[PDB]
Paper text:
Dystroglycan (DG), a ubiquitous membrane receptor belonging to the glycoprotein complex associated to dystrophin, plays a crucial role in the stability of the plasma membrane, especially in skeletal muscle tissues where it is highly expressed. A single gene, DAG1, encodes for a protein precursor, which is proteolytically cleaved in two subunits, alpha-dystroglycan (α-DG), located at the extracellular side of the plasma membrane where it binds several extracellular matrix proteins, and beta-dystroglycan (β-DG), which is a transmembrane protein that interacts with dystrophin in the cytoplasm. The molecular structure of the N-terminal region of α-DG (α-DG-Nt) was later determined at high resolution by X-ray crystallography, revealing the presence of two domains, an immunoglobulin-like (Ig-like) domain and a domain similar to the small subunit ribosomal protein S6 of T. termophilus (S6 domain), connected by a flexible loop. Noteworthy, it has been shown that α-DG-Nt is necessary for recruiting LARGE and some pathological conditions that are caused by missense mutations in the DAG1 map within the α-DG-Nt.
More recently, two additional mutations, namely V74I and D111N, located on the Ig-like domain surface facing the S6 domain within α-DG-Nt, have been found in a seven years old compound heterozygous patient, who displays mild muscular dystrophy and asymptomatic hyperCKemia. In particular, we focused on the murine α-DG-Nt region, fully validated as a model for the human counterpart, carrying the three pathological missense mutations V72I, D109N and T190M that correspond to their topological counterparts V74I, D111N and T192M in human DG. The crystal structures of D109N and V72I have been determined to a resolution of 1.70 Å and 1.80 Å, respectively. Similarly to what observed for T190M, residues 50–58 and 305–315, as well as residues 163–179 (V72I) or 164–179 (D109N), were missing in the D109N and V72I final models. That said, both D109N and V72I structures show the typical overall folding of α-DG-Nt. According to the refined crystallographic model, the pathological mutation Val72→Ile has no effect on the overall conformation of α-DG-Nt, but in this case also the local effects on the structure around the mutated residue are quite limited. On the contrary, the single mutant V72I shows a decrease both in Dmax (from 90 ± 3Å for WT to 80 ± 2Å for V72I) and in the Rg value (from 25.20 ± 0.04Å for the WT to 24.20 ± 0.04Å for V72I), pointing to a more compact shape as compared to the WT protein. In detail for V72I the profile is mainly unimodal characterized by a broader single peak: even if its maximum is slightly shifted to more compact models with Rg about 21–25 Å (60.4% of the total population), there is an increased fraction of extended models with intermediate Rg around 25–30 Å.
Author numbering: 59 to 162, 179 to 303
Amino acid sequence: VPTVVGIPDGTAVIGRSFRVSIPTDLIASSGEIIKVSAAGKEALPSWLHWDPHSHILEGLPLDTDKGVHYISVSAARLGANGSHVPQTSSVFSIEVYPEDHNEPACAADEPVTVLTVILDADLTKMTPKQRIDLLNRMQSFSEVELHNMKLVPVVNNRLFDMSAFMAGPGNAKKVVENGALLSWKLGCSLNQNSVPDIRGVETPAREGAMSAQLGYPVVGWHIANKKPT
């Protein structure tokens, strides 16, 4: 008598890490083969990665991933002739939303103080796991958890923010790629005198230790107050 497993729908935010556990032990009895894909395709959406050993589906969506993604979790039996005999399939969806509003909140009308690191990188050339690994490797410096950092592409080729009230240089002398912005929240309506200690960002950025850990050149960093939502 076959068992039916429903998986709940999820949500993701452009430029924020996405991570969910998939209940494979419920779906695959009797040593069956699990496949996780976009529904009706063999591959996942470009922003997702499936880790079969931890049972984790994870990703980092870009602007072009906005919208609903249906995900099929299937179990197949391997036949004596090597064929995969499908047994069951469970489909859920993930809706990618456009904006995290710079919030992992601040009062309304209260600007959010954001620290941004500008990287010589092109996120559209990076796999989902590479995007997550880059966020992981920033944790030593930000002291913010992976899921509370934001990672998005540079737009209109702007490698600077003229509203920033603190900033400094990285190790890069040239910028070869389009650029990526890796940012996090410091607080609400801060100024130079209430910003926390940032020597653990600014010194490794300038000396090259941050780029050596992240795997990408650092163009610079800045701190600026961003309009709410």
